[PDB]
Symmetry: C2
Subunit: 143 residues, 2 copies
């Protein structure tokens, strides 16, 4: 279904442009760090619980992330309907535990897990899981 | 002021991620080459009529462009309402002249302007002018 060349771009990077839908219908853009599960074909990112115009994400979870290739203009865009965990509220709740696994997948073992836990709570962190439904873009070539 | 920091990010780059809105309301992402006019605070890009982004802009002109700072992580996002010229129809029309102006600003003096003129018509090129109405993001020093 998906172009392996585009999936390779996603696999060879760890940051991209996340796009969600604001109340007025306009996309909200940001540079985020992500984890890509190549078998389950899903992308995971950590965000603070949205507020104001960005909160619309809660009622319309359609999202996309653009990832840059290593050549001149190539890029891949993963599209899907995001699933969100409730915001982190306790240093040991299910959400934080899930965010610890995400951190491990993206950066590895943290130096002060206790600091991390409180940071997640202070930022009302949400783990956004985006199962990939559509992949498009411009595939890089032999180089 | 703070906006000056976001505008400096935009002024210091020539590529960004354009987000248009699909027929169904979902964001559509792609990258684009651009020229920033500090004089009128405009972002100018060359797009082809048949492309998805152009068709999206013809129905809903709202657009956003995210640009990375020189650190590749900090960024700025320009939000505004796109103004599109009709597609180049004749080698000497105003749309072509506007595209010649853009080419000079982005790449410099073309070797064969007559060839460029023909090319713009063949590709149904359009000049996208995005006056920056609002800017947001996390400029250097905030990440």
């Amino acid at each position: 279904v998906f172009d392996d060349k585009l999936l390779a771009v996603i696999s060879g990077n760890s940051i991209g442009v996340l796009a969600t839908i604001k109340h007025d219908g306009r996309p909200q853009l940001s540079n985020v760090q992500y984890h890509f599960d190549p078998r389950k074909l899903l992308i995971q990112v950590s965000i603070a619980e949205p507020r104001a115009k960005t909160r619309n994400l809660r009622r319309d979870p359609r999202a996309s992330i653009l990832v840059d290739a290593d050549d001149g203009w190539s890029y891949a865009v993963a599209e899907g309907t995001a699933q969100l965990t409730p915001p982190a509220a306790a240093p040991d709740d299910d959400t934080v535990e899930a965010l610890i696994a995400l951190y491990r997948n993206i950066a590895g073992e943290h130096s002060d897990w206790d600091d991390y836990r409180q940071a997640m709570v202070t930022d009302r962190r949400v783990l956004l899981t985006l199962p990939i439904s559509h992949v498009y873009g411009l595939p890089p070539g032999m180089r």
